[PDB]
């Protein structure tokens, strides 16, 4: 229930960015709570503690490009514009929903702390890229064809993000997608259920820009014809591809460190070495992640075996080919470098957000103390920057 504070302890709002298959606010169901699960309401807790926070609402299955744009408009407000060139290339709708805007004042000089979990960490990085450099393809497209271009793709918009803090983010992708998720058979099943769900207006998987909604005065025949011919089934413009090792690396090659931003990663492991060097899921591993945790533990790439049930340790620690440094909670602050936090033994992909109801070992006060620590770290940054 609780509103943001009149007089907040932080001058830069904490913006939380959920991950793949994540739903927050009024696209969520009955009583599902992404940030906290059944164990805690982290929005209520942080705001009662005096902080100004927001939980961004972006597509569950869409690409990081889609989601990074949606994040911009979630904060700044307006009609989502995915880009004329990008949308033409991948063969989908250019315009999405329209958000009201929770921080219309968001501009250079009045920045934000971006905390992301899982795929949200990729989405944040991709947004900061478009803010700073824009997108050269979009500028070239509107130079060539005219029309309007989004402020976001124009670029030259710095000093809008203070810190980027990722939690169990597959910066380097995950075998879970390579070998399972983005397989033609699984992704067919998923996108088919999402289209059926969109058509029935039952659940918004954030993929309506692919034509899942049925147009006006359209026979069912035409509708089934458009969907069958949609470029979605083969497209690289999906979240599942961006969670692939190859697709994550495509993003890694786009992004570069901003010397004025504070970066930090939080990584979990919930597997243990066994016979032959294989890894198997700890007792307490979240139910739905047991299978993927076990698969990742047995892959050929030996260093990728330790994992949180979805993301390998070395994937979460930092993006490859980007400067990093080992620190802990008492280390001094560093700008422009990925501050790699010690691996948290016993924490799985879901535990980080309290979404493991069966795991009694992870209490509500432990989860609350973890986000306290993060926010204290963000207040250290604000203190260090003012002076
Ligand atoms: Ca667990
Ligand atoms: Zn797209």
> With the C-alpha atoms ordered 21, 23, 27, 29, is the resulting torsion angle positive or negative?
positive
Residue 66 CA to ligand 2 center (angstroms) comes to 5
| 357: DSSP letter | T
Which ligand is located closest to the Cα atom of residue 88?
2
Q: Which residues, by Cβ under 5 Å, contact ligand 2, an ion?
A: 66, 90, 237
Tell me which CATH homologous superfamily contains domain 1-387.
Answer: Alpha/Beta hydrolase fold, catalytic domain (3.40.50.1820)
Question: Of the candidates 365, 343, 370, 305, which has an alpha carbon nearest to the alpha carbon of residue 168?
Answer: 343
Q: Which residues pair with 272 in a beta bridge?
A: 280
Question: Of the candidates 71, 61, 59, 63, which has an alpha carbon nearest to the alpha carbon of residue 15?
Answer: 71
Q: Could you give phi then psi for residue 386, rounded to 5 degrees? A: -60, -50
Binding-site entries? 284, 348, 351, 356, 359
Q: What are the angstrom distances between the C-alpha of 323 and each of 12, 117, 293, 334?
A: 25, 21, 28, 11
Q: Which of the residues are catalytic?
A: 118, 308, 349
Q: What are the angstrom distances between the C-alpha of 57 and each of 21, 30, 78, 160, 222?
A: 11, 16, 14, 19, 31
Binding-site entries for Ca(2+)? 284, 348, 351, 356, 359
Residue 126 CA to ligand 2 center (angstroms) comes to 13
Residue 105 CA, chain-centre distance (Å), reads 23
Torsion of CA 23, 27, 32, 36, to 10 degrees: 50
* Rounded (5°) CA angle 283-288-289: 60
Residue 92 CA to ligand 2 center (angstroms) comes to 7
What does the domain layout of the chain look like in residue ranges? 1-387
Q: What are the angstrom distances between the C-alpha of 276 and each of 281, 283, 312?
A: 15, 20, 18
Which ligand is located closest to the Cα atom of residue 367?
1
* Cα–Cα distance, 182 to 194 (Å, whole number): 15
Which ligand is located closest to the Cα atom of residue 231?
2
Which position has the token pair 């999402």?
A: 194
């Amino acid at each position: 229930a609780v509103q943001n504070p009149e007089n907040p302890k932080n001058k830069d709002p904490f913006v939380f960015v959920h991950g793949f298959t994540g739903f927050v606010g009024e696209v969520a169901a009955k009583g599902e709570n992404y940030w906290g699960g059944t164990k805690a309401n982290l929005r209520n807790h942080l705001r009662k503690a005096g902080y100004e926070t927001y939980e961004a609402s972006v597509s569950a299955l869409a690409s990081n490009h889609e989601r990074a744009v949606e994040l911009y408009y979630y904060l700044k407000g307006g009609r989502v514009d995915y880009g004329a060139a990008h949308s033409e290339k991948y063969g989908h709708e250019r315009y999405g929903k329209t958000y009201e805007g929770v921080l219309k004042d968001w501009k250079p000089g009045h920045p934000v702390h971006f905390i992301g979990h899982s795929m949200g960490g990729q989405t944040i990085r991709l947004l900061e890229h478009y803010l700073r450099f824009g997108d050269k393809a979009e500028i070239a497209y509107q130079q060539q064809h005219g029309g309007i271009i989004s402020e976001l793709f124009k670029g030259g918009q710095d000093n809008m993000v203070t810190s980027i803090t990722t939690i169990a983010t597959p910066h380097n992708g995950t075998h879970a997608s390579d070998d399972i998720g983005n397989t033609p058979t699984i992704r067919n099943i998923l996108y088919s259920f999402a289209q059926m769900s969109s058509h029935l207006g039952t659940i918004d998987f954030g993929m309506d820009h692919w034509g899942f909604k049925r147009k006006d005065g359209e026979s069912l025949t035409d509708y089934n014809k458009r969907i069958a011919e949609s470029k979605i089934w083969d497209s690289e413009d999906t979240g599942l591809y961006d969670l692939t090792r190859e697709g994550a690396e495509k993003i890694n090659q786009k992004t570069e460190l901003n010397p004025n931003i504070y970066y930090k990663t939080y990584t979990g492991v919930a597997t243990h070495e066994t016979q032959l060097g294989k890894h198997i899921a700890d007792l307490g591993m979240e139910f739905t992640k047991i299978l993927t945790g076990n698969y990742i533990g047995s892959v050929d790439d030996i260093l990728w075996r330790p994992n949180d049930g979805l993301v390998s340790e070395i994937s979460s620690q930092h993006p490859s080919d980007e400067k990093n440094i080992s620190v802990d909670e008492n280390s001094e602050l560093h700008k422009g470098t990925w501050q790699v936090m010690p691996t948290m033994k016993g924490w799985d992909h879901s535990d980080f957000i309290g979404n493991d109801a069966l795991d009694t070992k992870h209490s509500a006060i432990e989860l609350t103390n973890f986000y306290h620590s993060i926010s204290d770290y963000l207040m250290r940054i604000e203190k260090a920057e003012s002076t």
